[PDB]
């Protein structure tokens, strides 16, 4: 379907309401590396089995959290292009599943959001790097580090100051321990934005003060659960304040080169000075590598979802056409 538009009414309101109760997982229910989508599935803003259409995801992040429309469109269609089934229009918010339908031919993976190196990547705050065996489940040791950083830099709350320090710590931990650490292009951008999301979207909208308490943080990150009486943010937003996180410890895009402590800058990578390059490489390299020579029906679905992706791209970038117009 067409990408949903912005909310008609973006006021703060109770989103942990009678129509959207938290429920535990049933056998087969999928949760993944994103605490936002996980919480929306566990409150029935998304299908509770964790398999959704792009339009369901965009409507859920707007209605449940007041995620802004352009951000919702960009992230949802990026995820769907690399991890979703373009013919059935279904995406898993976690593991690969037969529930997204018959797979396209290799080298397309349709691996769900758990697929490493498409959307998901290294130096996550509460999830381990894929090299360590699990890129999707809540990790208590990593969450306790988030609590420690909140105690040291946030007066016991998670805020953008904490985000700036923790983002850098996770990068340094990956450089020191993950010989395959990758921090370029799409992951370089999204890794910084994601650290603002708890301060911008997990804070009760009646306060909207950017100070996330650790009880609320655990409820979202571990249990995919809104606090009792949770109000969504009082206006549409996503990554506002990402400039604070970058400014704390400015990094160049790069990777470990098959050994720990070998972080090598990639001059072919996009960085925050070249946001349009990040979009162009995502389409021309990442998407194209999954679908190098698609059949007629796949080509049509790709071009449709690429048009939708471009709706989410900041004004001033040129649309690219890997399969023609």
Ligand X SMILES: CCCCCCCCCCCCCC
Site membership for ligand HEM, residue 36 (CB under 6 A): yes
Is 217 one of the binding residues for ligand HEM (CB under 6 A)?
A: no
| Closest approach of ligand X to the CB of residue 276, in Å | 6
- Cα–Cα dist 184/187, whole Å: 6
* Residue 317, strand partner residues: 315
Judged by CB under 6 A, does residue 193 bind ligand X? yes
Which residue carries 């049509």 as its tokens? 300
- Told to check if 320 binds ligand NAG by CB under 6 A, we report yes
Name the minimum Å distance from CB 124 to Mg ion.
3
- Identify the helix (H) or strand (E) that includes residue 52: strand 51-52
State the Cα–Cα distance between residues 112 and 125, nearest whole angstrom.
20
The answer to the question of residue 198 lying near ligand HEM (CB under 6 A) is yes
Bridge partner residues of 120 (DSSP): 116
Q: Which of 110, 201, 245, 309 binds ligand HEM (CB under 6 A)?
A: 201
Among Cl ion, Mg ion, ligand HEM, none, what does residue 194 contact (CB within 5–8 Å per kind)? ligand HEM
Q: Where are the alpha helices (DSSP H) in the chain?
A: 35-42, 54-65, 69-83, 140-153, 160-177, 185-201, 214-221, 242-248, 275-281, 288-290, 296-311
Judged by CB under 6 A, the residue of 25, 55, 87, 142 near ligand NAG is 142
CB atoms within 10 A of CB 274: 14
Regarding 37 and contact with ligand HEM (CB under 6 A), the answer is yes
Whether residue 34 is annotated as binding a ligand: the answer is yes
- How is residue 29 written in tokens? 């229910």
In 3D space, the residue among 306, 284, 319, 237 whose CA is nearest the CA of residue 3 turns out to be 306
Instruction: Identify which of 188, 152, 151, 197 has the alpha carbon closest to the alpha carbon of residue 170.
Output: 188
Instruction: Indicate whether 128 belongs to the interface with ligand HEM (CB under 6 A).
Output: no
Closer Cβ to ligand NAG, 279 or 308, answer by number: 279
Classify the C-alpha dihedral 161-165-171-173 as positive or negative. Answer: negative
By CB under 6 A, is residue 61 in contact with ligand HEM?
yes
Q: Is 6 in the site for Cl ion (CB under 5 A)?
A: yes
Residues that bind Mg ion (CB under 5 A): 120, 124, 127, 135
Considering only residues 71, 123, 217, 283, which one is a binding residue for ligand X as defined by CB under 6 A?
A: 71
The distance between the two most distant Cα atoms of the chain, rounded to a whole number of Å, is 56
Token pair listed for 92: 């898993």
Query: Cβ of residue 62: shortest distance to Cl ion, in angstroms?
Result: 7
Quick check: 178 binds ligand HEM (CB under 6 A)? no
| Interaction partner, residue 76 (ligand HEM, Mg ion, ligand NAG, none; CB < 5-8 Å by kind) | ligand HEM
Which spans of this chain sit near ligand NAG (rule: CB under 6 A)?
A: 9, 11, 13, 116-117, 128, 130-131, 139-142, 154-155, 159-161, 180, 182, 210, 277, 280-281, 284, 320-322
Residue numbers in the known binding site for heme are: 34
């Amino acid at each position: 379907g067409l990408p949903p538009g912005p909310l008609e009414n973006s006021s703060a309101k109770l989103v942990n309401d009678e129509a959207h109760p938290w429920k535990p997982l049933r056998p087969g229910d999928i949760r993944g590396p994103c605490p936002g989508l996980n919480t929306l599935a566990s409150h029935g803003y998304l299908p509770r089995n964790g398999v959704a259409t792009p339009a369901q995801i965009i409507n859920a992040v707007q209605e449940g959290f007041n995620f802004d429309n352009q951000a919702a469109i960009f992230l949802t269609y990026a995820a769907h292009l690399v991890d979703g089934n373009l013919i059935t229009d279904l995406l898993s918010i976690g593991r690969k599943t037969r529930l997204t339908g018959p797979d396209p031919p290799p080298p397309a993976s349709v691996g769900g959001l758990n697929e490493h190196g498409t959307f998901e990547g290294d130096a996550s705050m509460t999830r381990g790097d894929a090299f360590f065996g699990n890129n999707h489940d809540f990790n208590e040791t990593l969450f306790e580090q988030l609590v420690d950083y909140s105690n040291r830099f946030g007066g016991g709350k998670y805020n953008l100051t904490v985000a700036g320090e923790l983002r850098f710590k996770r990068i340094q931990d990956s450089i020191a321990t993950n010989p395959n650490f990758s921090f370029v292009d799409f992951r370089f951008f999204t890794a910084y934005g994601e650290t603002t999301f708890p301060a911008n979207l997990f804070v009760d909208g009646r306060r909207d003060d950017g100070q996330l308490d650790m009880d609320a943080a655990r409820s979202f990150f571990q249990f995919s659960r809104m606090p009792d009486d949770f109000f969504r943010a009082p206006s549409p937003r996503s990554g506002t304040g990402v400039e604070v996180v970058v400014q704390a410890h400015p990094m160049q895009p790069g990777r470990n080169v098959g050994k720990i402590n070998s972080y090598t800058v990639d001059p072919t990578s996009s960085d925050f000075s070249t946001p349009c390059l990040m979009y162009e490489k995502f389409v021309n390299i990442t998407v194209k590598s999954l679908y190098p020579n698609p059949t007629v029906q796949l080509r049509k679905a790709l071009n449709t979802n690429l048009d939708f992706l471009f709706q989410g791209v900041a004004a001033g970038c040129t649309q690219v056409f890997p399969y023609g117009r």
